[PDB]
């Protein structure tokens, strides 16, 4: 397992990764030093003898250059110590180990390599500084942020293997994944939020900025689109200039809730012939969804056009967002006075209800549900009440938020954050729980020495009325600390056991493939599936379609 199944290799590198809005999807930012370090053997041919001669003339230390020169006899010439490093007559058939240059096929990898999208072939772009620069939209398949993450890079040493990397392991070829028959890459973070802020109907763009955004697209036809507004002032909408990024022949139709072809809420999405007709573009569209824009563009125009699409969208949206700006402060966590009052009174009536149920249970009037203890029924009721309280106050705080509220904006765009985040930050973080149950009696008949015995009150068993804005009391803080602690514990345990399960699964289904008869077998020839997937289709080229014959009345079917 340590020297045969997996072993240390040459022509490899590892560095801290960083995001780069101005790199293509299938590219990788490679530091110059690594470029001078890693090398590729290129045989001298009439097509490249001049270039290779120039590279040898540059030698090491200067990129692009070369490290070694292999002759016919097999002798190795070191271009940093040899006396004849200046004068070399490159004979045909000689090998030249040159520095890694631009548009070279390399293998980008990040541990743990859970699925095949953890190792993908990228195009080299030699850049300054000491970081592996990668496109934002390639974050998802690698599962990688930039808070200190490090990635590895491997280099092919022959034409056939780099052919394998470029024709099989290429990033555009991995856009639509056979895992969930959907694209595993999409628009995220700034590009997402921004594309939500751009496609608003209040978003109009004047001449100059429009010209800049237009020129920012490398696949621009150079044709200025006729503005949505002519008089009194020529204006372009965000959708209009964003349409330039979307290729022709692209048709996308999706109805949300009240999407009635006129859409008073500007919801849903209609895009005709690479031109967005109506709807706000966000996660449901430009994200990594099933019938998303990326999936359609990939299956229609191709993987290359889709990667270039990533590029264009990123460039335009990031440009507009750069000159529009977006932030987030504590003010985006402050609901109105009366709202906080209704929240407090909600928690109040909740605790009142819990109190009443408690008193009822103590009066031996509580009738146990069929199949559980009186005490278990009581616990269930109280827990449900406190949960309903948190959800209620949270929904109040959510309703109170404005459309200009930055947090709510990020939630709308689908960039980051959800409802419970708003609920806990602004309203009430809710009930803490350990091992499924609320804070148990660590001490005799009590959770903390600050409480009396047999105190089943919400504040005693770990309910936190306060929000992160208001601040937690010592008790609430300690209980929350217990909850978070259990969180970290079961997190480590989870990644451990999953770490094992993955390996077990891999080793179990290791030698299974589709033979030249669509028969899924193994190394023994044992038939697992007579026809792969019981249909013989590759999971990549499969989309969720409706069978409109299985539904509707017989009269409608006939009609």
């Amino acid at each position: 397992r340590g020297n045969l199944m997996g072993k240390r290799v040459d022509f490899s590198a590892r560095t801290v990764i960083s995001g780069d809005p101005n790199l293509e999807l299938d590219q990788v930012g490679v530091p110059k030093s690594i470029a001078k370090t890693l090398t590729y053997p290129e045989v001298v041919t009439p097509y490249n003898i001049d270039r290779l001669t120039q590279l040898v003339r540059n030698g090491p230390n200067e990129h692009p250059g070369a490290k070694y020169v292999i002759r016919d006899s097999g002798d190795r010439i070191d271009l940093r110590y040899s006396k004849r490093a200046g004068d070399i007559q490159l004979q045909y058939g000689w090998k030249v180990e040159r520095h890694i240059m631009d548009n070279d096929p390399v293998l980008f990898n990040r541990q743990p390599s859970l699925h095949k999208m953890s190792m993908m072939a990228h195009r080299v772009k030699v850049i300054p500084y000491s970081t592996f620069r990668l496109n934002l939209s390639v974050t998802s398949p690698y599962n990688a942020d930039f808070d200190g993450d490090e990635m590895n890079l491997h280099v092919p040493q022959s034409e056939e293997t780099r052919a394998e990397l470029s024709q099989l392991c290429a990033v555009p070829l991995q856009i639509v994944s056979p895992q969930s028959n959907k694209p595993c890459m999409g628009i995220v973070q700034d590009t997402l939020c921004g594309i939500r802020k751009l496609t608003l109907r209040d978003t109009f763009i004047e001449l100059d900025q429009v010209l800049n955004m237009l020129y920012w697209v490398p696949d621009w036809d150079g044709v200025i689109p006729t503005p949505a507004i002519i008089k009194p002032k020529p204006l372009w909408s965000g959708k209009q200039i964003l349409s330039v990024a979307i290729p022709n022949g692209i048709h996308l139709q999706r109805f949300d809730e009240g999407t009635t072809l006129l859409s008073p809420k500007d919801n849903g999405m209609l895009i005709i012939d690479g031109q967005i007709i109506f709807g706000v573009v966000e996660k449901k569209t430009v994200g990594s969804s099933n019938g998303g824009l990326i999936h359609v563009v990939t299956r229609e125009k191709g993987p290359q056009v889709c990667a270039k699409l990533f590029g264009n969208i990123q460039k335009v949206v990031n440009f507009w967002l750069l000159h529009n700006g977006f932030s987030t402060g504590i003010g985006d966590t402050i609901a109105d006075g009366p709202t906080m009052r209704e929240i407090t009174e909600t928690i109040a009536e909740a605790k009142k209800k819990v109190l009443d149920v408690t008193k009822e249970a103590q009066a031996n009037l509580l009738t146990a549900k069929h199949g559980m203890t009186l005490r278990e029924s009581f616990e269930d009721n109280v827990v449900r009440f406190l949960n309903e309280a948190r959800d209620k106050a949270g929904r109040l705080a959510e309703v109170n938020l404005k459309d200009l509220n930055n947090v709510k904006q990020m939630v709308m765009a689908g960039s980051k954050g959800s409802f419970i985040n708003i609920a806990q930050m602004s309203a009430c973080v809710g009930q803490q729980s350990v091992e499924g149950k609320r804070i148990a009696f660590g001490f005799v008949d009590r959770t903390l020495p600050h409480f009396s015995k047999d105190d089943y009150s919400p504040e005693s068993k770990g309910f936190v009325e306060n929000s992160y804005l208001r601040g937690l009391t010592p008790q609430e803080f300690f209980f929350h600390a217990m909850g978070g602690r259990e969180g970290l514990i079961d997190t480590a345990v989870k990644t451990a056991e999953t770490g094992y399960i993955q390996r077990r699964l891999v080793k179990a289904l290791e030698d299974i493939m589709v033979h030249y008869d669509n028969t899924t077998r193994n190394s023994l020839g044992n038939v697992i599936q007579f026809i792969y997937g019981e249909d013989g289709m590759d999971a990549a080229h499969i989309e969720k379609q409706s069978l409109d014959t299985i539904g509707g009345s017989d009269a409608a079917f006939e009609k």
Binding site: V514, I542, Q545
Partner: protein, 156 residues
């Protein structure tokens, strides 16, 4: 009704009523024989297996049964003529395109899909946070638990 199938027919159709720019107020230069026999002969080309014996052919029809159901559902005479109002050229183009995309959608022999499956199940199990569910339940399933933690009986 919504189920994962190869070849998005909707996109092909909406591309047909866009590539040829057909108007919704013009008689179609088609025939009942064109549509019916055309679609019926289209199913003959949607090949997954290519044997010459009865077994392989049965496996073939069984393999393309669902997609053929979808095909007939979308390419019905009433639907083709009234809902899409396609022409002869547009209909033929649709047929050829469907056949092409279907032939593309076939899995390529040599596809190490065992490992692909193991990873396609293992990876999403990593992003996982009243019976026992989640990672412990998965561990029970894979280990084939002699004594599962929450044995349940659902009686109708």
């Amino acid at each position: 009704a919504n189920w994962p199938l190869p070849v998005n027919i909707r996109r092909i159709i909406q591309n047909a009523q866009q590539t040829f720019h057909i108007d919704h107020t013009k008689p179609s230069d088609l025939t009942i024989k064109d549509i019916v026999l055309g679609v019926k002969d289209l199913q003959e080309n949607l090949l997954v297996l290519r044997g010459k014996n009865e077994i392989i052919q049965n496996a073939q029809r069984d393999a393309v049964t669902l997609f053929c159901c979808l095909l007939r559902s979308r390419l019905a005479t009433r639907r083709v003529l009234q809902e899409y109002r396609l022409t002869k050229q547009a209909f033929d183009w649709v047929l050829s395109n469907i056949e092409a995309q279907f032939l593309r959608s076939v899995v390529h022999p040599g596809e190490m899909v065992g490992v692909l499956a193991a990873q396609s199940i293992g990876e999403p199990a990593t992003q996982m946070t009243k019976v026992t569910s989640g990672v412990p339940r998965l561990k029970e399933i894979l280990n084939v638990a002699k004594n599962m933690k929450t044995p349940s009986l659902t009686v109708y």
